[PDB]
Symmetry: C3
Amino acid sequence: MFRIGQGFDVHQLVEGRPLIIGGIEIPYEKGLLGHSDADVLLHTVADACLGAVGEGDIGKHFPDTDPEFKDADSFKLLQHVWGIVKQKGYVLGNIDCTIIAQKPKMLPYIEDMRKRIAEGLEADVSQVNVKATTTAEGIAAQATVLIQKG
Amino acid sequence: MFRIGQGFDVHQLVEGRPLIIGGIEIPYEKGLLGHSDADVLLHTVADACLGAVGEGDIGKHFPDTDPEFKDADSFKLLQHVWGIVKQKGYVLGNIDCTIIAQKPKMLPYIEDMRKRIAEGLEADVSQVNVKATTTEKLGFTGRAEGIAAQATVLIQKG
Amino acid sequence: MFRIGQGFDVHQLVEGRPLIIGGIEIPYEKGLLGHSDADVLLHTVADACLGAVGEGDIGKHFPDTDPEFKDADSFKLLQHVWGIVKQKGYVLGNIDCTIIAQKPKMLPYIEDMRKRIAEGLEADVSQVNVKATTTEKLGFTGRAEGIAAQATVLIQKG
Ligand SMILES: [Mg+2]
Ligand SMILES: [Mg+2]
Ligand SMILES: [Mg+2]
């Protein structure tokens, strides 16, 4: 058995907050707006994993209104989501993710995002793909995941 | 043997139509514009299914020109599409779907959509995921001009 | 083993360039803007394929700044990508693609794009699905600024 999931998120850009994407802090004048660290890539990854196993989305498991998830580290939240997936008997097949952002340039941080995502999904880096495009009020991300019994 | 499909659709919100999403009636003062009931989520589920078996899209099977599909029930269209998938030898593995909408809030109706989609794919509700998110006021859906959806389906021999 | 990949791309329609989509030249007033032939659909197919094997995106293999990307034939680029997939031991499961464009009407060329993509992926036409949808006048594609495409691929050991 394999199962498929998909995630899509957008976060608003704003001054004063730090920019964190795929678990990596990126030097920039504007961070993303959110109640947790607002890592839009790790949120999308988490939502794709939740969706593959039929467990709604991260809003359902870590609500915005829950003070416990104020300034939450989104890598920790991904680890908990991955606990839910493992409990259903699944491991990672592979994941393919896209960051949509006009600025900053993501290329110098992509390889550490992949390591970080792999770590959070307990997989090898060869199972994780991250790309960026630009095509500027926010940063979006999309992810598609295939999980397998294991 | 597994096959993947993907659907993407977007409908304009207007005054003076019902809002029907995922086969569920949502009491709301705007609804979706289209030749059929405009059910954006069932259209993307149906497109994902047709995509997975190489049978085009709903436009091919139920065109806007042909007048007989005027105000058609999108649940009924989904069942006809599911008939095509079954004839090819496939059943549902699982489906993950996203509604993209600033308003209204979808969360009270999610479980019902999942039930209705499960019924249309002849599947267990554990096989169907539906989530709703906003674009944080950004874009055509962010400013309530329309509702978008996406769906990704995995089907398997059965 | 099966692997999944996803691609997404958007290109501007501009005056006096050919419109090449899915490897097929379509008669039209405008073409897509880019360094290569700007075939938005073959770019997304290529990206989905590279994504499935963890090899980045077309920009990693054929940067904009590479003089052989200038006016490159995106079908040849797809064949290069497919060689990468084949060296890892995979063949096509199936692919489902969507062209989002307000105009022109894709429907007369779809079958040819399917055959071309099938040829590039060394597969049967039954494994390739391509659908075309308009945006209902909404967004950047809805206001004829461009053409968008998405593709989801399932590959398998072969
Ligand atoms: Mg988020
Ligand atoms: Mg529709
Ligand atoms: Mg391109």
